[PDB]
Amino acid sequence: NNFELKLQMSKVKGVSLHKFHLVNDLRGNLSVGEFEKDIPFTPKRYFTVFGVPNKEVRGEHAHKECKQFLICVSGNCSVLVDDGENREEYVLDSIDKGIYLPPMTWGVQYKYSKDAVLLVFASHYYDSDDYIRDYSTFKQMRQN
Amino acid sequence: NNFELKLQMSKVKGVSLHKFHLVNDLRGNLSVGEFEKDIPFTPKRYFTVFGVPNKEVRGEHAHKECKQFLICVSGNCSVLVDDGENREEYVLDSIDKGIYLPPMTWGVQYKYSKDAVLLVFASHYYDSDDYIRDYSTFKQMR
Ligand SMILES: Cc1cn([C@H]2C[C@H](O)[C@@H](COP(=O)(O)OP(=O)(O)O[C@H]3O[C@H](C)[C@@H](NC=O)[C@H](O)[C@H]3O)O2)c(=O)[nH]c1=O
Ligand SMILES: Cc1cn([C@H]2C[C@H](O)[C@@H](COP(=O)(O)OP(=O)(O)O[C@H]3O[C@H](C)[C@@H](NC=O)[C@H](O)[C@H]3O)O2)c(=O)[nH]c1=O
Ligand SMILES: [Cl-]
Ligand SMILES: [Cl-]
Ligand code: NA
């Protein structure tokens, strides 16, 4: 359903779901994305989450300025995105599926498979002060 | 012991081997790098190579302008790099290992494991004319 087109918008504010160009041939397989085109920003940072125990739960934050883009490059994991009003779960289970999380998207990442690797591109360098880490505070900042 | 340190320079001109900041906790591992810091350029493109048959040999050419940065995020592969005078092989077998290929590095990726997934950051959008395919030309240029 959710990642069938190259680009589709979530009900969750600003969140976009992406299907990256894929070449399958005799010699192997290749998926590709272009920054400022398929991923709607230029990254200053990347990180990878891996080796997550069975049923462990990560995230429970929103970012005030940092844009993020998530691709599960091995295995599978599930993501909940929440704009304060609307929330949805998406399953990142193939290398050509990506999800854009604009700033002020409360996100959780969970149900990682044993060999799952989540890749994240980030618009901003790492800054611990960019995080909102409790949900009620996030809700106040989302109010109209 | 090639990726022992945060940073080490290959004998192959301008090639650098990288070990990324890694934080483990009870919920697993996070490794991170920053563009124009640990990785010496900002990408315009990324690509992933996967499901490569074990006998395949990929590359055998160089780029005129495109900078690349390679991390094997799952499984293992080997990389051969050549500046025209020196050649070396490095094994990308862990997610916190990376290698920088500056322009005019004649490169090969091979010995992919069944489960290998190679992630590449590129400084330029895909360009079919960015390739140097004749080794003699490549050496002359260097
Ligand atoms: C992203 C980062 C962390 N650390 C350090 C901070 C923590 O000590 C450790 C784990 O971070 P944390 O507990 O936030 O891991 P998680 O709960 O997995 O959250 C991480 O991944 C999420 C997908 C992101 N988005 C929404 O939740 C988060 O921005 C990202 O942090 O890595 C960096 O040093 N440098 C860094 O660039
Ligand atoms: C990298 C790319 C290819 N294609 C298309 C062009 C080719 O038809 C096919 C695979 O390319 P190719 O035969 O070069 O795969 P390889 O032989 O694996 O070489 C690729 O990976 C290497 C790390 C790089 N350098 C190697 O020393 C190369 O830049 C990169 O091309 O995918 C993109 O559309 N968009 C793209 O971004
Ligand atoms: Cl889904
Ligand atoms: Cl090595
Ligand atoms: Na609260």
PDB file of N, CA, C and O in Angstrom, chain A residues 37 42 69 82 100 118 125:
ATOM      1  N   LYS A  37      16.357  16.228  -4.052  1.00  0.00           N
ATOM      2  CA  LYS A  37      15.477  15.838  -5.118  1.00  0.00           C
ATOM      3  C   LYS A  37      14.611  14.744  -4.538  1.00  0.00           C
ATOM      4  O   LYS A  37      13.454  14.987  -4.238  1.00  0.00           O
ATOM      5  N   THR A  42      19.734  18.564   2.100  1.00  0.00           N
ATOM      6  CA  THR A  42      21.110  18.118   2.058  1.00  0.00           C
ATOM      7  C   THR A  42      21.587  17.759   3.435  1.00  0.00           C
ATOM      8  O   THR A  42      21.401  18.540   4.378  1.00  0.00           O
ATOM      9  N   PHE A  69      15.716  11.545   7.580  1.00  0.00           N
ATOM     10  CA  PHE A  69      15.211  10.683   6.504  1.00  0.00           C
ATOM     11  C   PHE A  69      15.657   9.269   6.852  1.00  0.00           C
ATOM     12  O   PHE A  69      16.857   9.045   7.120  1.00  0.00           O
ATOM     13  N   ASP A  82       4.213  11.019  14.395  1.00  0.00           N
ATOM     14  CA  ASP A  82       3.094  11.658  15.121  1.00  0.00           C
ATOM     15  C   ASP A  82       3.325  13.167  15.033  1.00  0.00           C
ATOM     16  O   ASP A  82       4.383  13.689  15.392  1.00  0.00           O
ATOM     17  N   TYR A 100      10.490  10.432   5.112  1.00  0.00           N
ATOM     18  CA  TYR A 100      10.910  11.765   5.516  1.00  0.00           C
ATOM     19  C   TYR A 100      10.154  12.177   6.777  1.00  0.00           C
ATOM     20  O   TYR A 100       8.912  12.233   6.781  1.00  0.00           O
ATOM     21  N   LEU A 118      19.041   0.471  10.456  1.00  0.00           N
ATOM     22  CA  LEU A 118      18.315   1.654  10.062  1.00  0.00           C
ATOM     23  C   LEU A 118      19.344   2.733   9.747  1.00  0.00           C
ATOM     24  O   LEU A 118      20.159   3.105  10.574  1.00  0.00           O
ATOM     25  N   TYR A 125      24.014  18.915  12.075  1.00  0.00           N
ATOM     26  CA  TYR A 125      24.961  18.204  12.929  1.00  0.00           C
ATOM     27  C   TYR A 125      24.282  17.846  14.242  1.00  0.00           C
ATOM     28  O   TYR A 125      23.338  18.504  14.686  1.00  0.00           O
TER      29      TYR A 125
END
